[PDB]
Paper text:
The eukaryotic La protein recognizes the 3′ poly(U) sequences of nascent RNA polymerase III transcripts to assist folding and maturation. The LaNTD contains the La motif and RRM1, the domains required for high-affinity binding of 3′ oligo(U) RNA (Kenan, 1995; Goodier et al., 1997; Jacks et al., 2003; Alfano et al., 2004); indeed, it has been shown that the two domains must act synergistically to bind 3′ oligo(U) tails (Goodier et al., 1997; Ohndorf et al., 2001; Alfano et al., 2004; Dong et al., 2004).
In fact, it closely resembles the U−1/U−4 stacking observed for AUUUU and thus permits U−3 to make the same base-specific hydrogen bonds that were described above for U−4 in the AUUUU RNA oligomer. The LaNTD:RNA complexes involving AUUUU and AUAAUUU occur in different space groups, C222 and C2, respectively, making it difficult to distinguish the effects of the RNA sequence and the local crystallographic packing environment on the conformation of the bound RNA. The measured average value of R2/R1 was around 27 for RNA-bound LaNTD, congruent with the R2/R1 ratio predictions performed with HYDRONMR (Bernado et al., 2002) using the coordinates of the LaNTD:AUAAUUU complex.
Residue numbers in the entry: 6 to 192
Write the structure that this text describes.
Amino acid sequence: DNEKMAALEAKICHQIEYYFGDFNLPRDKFLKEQIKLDEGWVPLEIMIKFNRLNRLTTDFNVIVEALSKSKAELMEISEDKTKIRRSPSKPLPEVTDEYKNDVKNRSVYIKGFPTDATLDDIKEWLEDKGQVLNIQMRRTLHKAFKGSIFVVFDSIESAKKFVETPGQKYKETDLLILFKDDYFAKK
RNA sequence: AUAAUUU
């Protein structure tokens, strides 16, 4: 029973840490704007507008409880517990040629998912393939899922090991896997 | 329609 509460809390921490994480934050206009208002602090009242978090829970107390137990320890909770922020002690990394070169080399391309698959479907399928930091479902201008995605692993090592595996299939359907830069090379 | 949404 309470194990499901732990499961819910782990999901809450992951979703919030994604929003304020190294991959997302630098390209999140709405969030970078909010962060400029009160020294990084963002009211839970605002955090609740984030769709994926909303679907997990809308309750402030549950969110605070979950974050206070987070292992990652990326987020800080205010004293009155009405707002949160990325720790000032965990600044965003400087984006150098080296950093970008490393991110590109940890990025993979995977084609072959059914057009109706959701982000949750894919996340679950990637659960046993290594540490993932970002999943980008490729869509058309009108936001229609093409069935192909880009995945960013925690390191070039886990990325390499994923691409090295030739017998991978989704719901018993073959998949085309390539390093992102290799996918572009062809295109 | 910054009515931005893995906001």
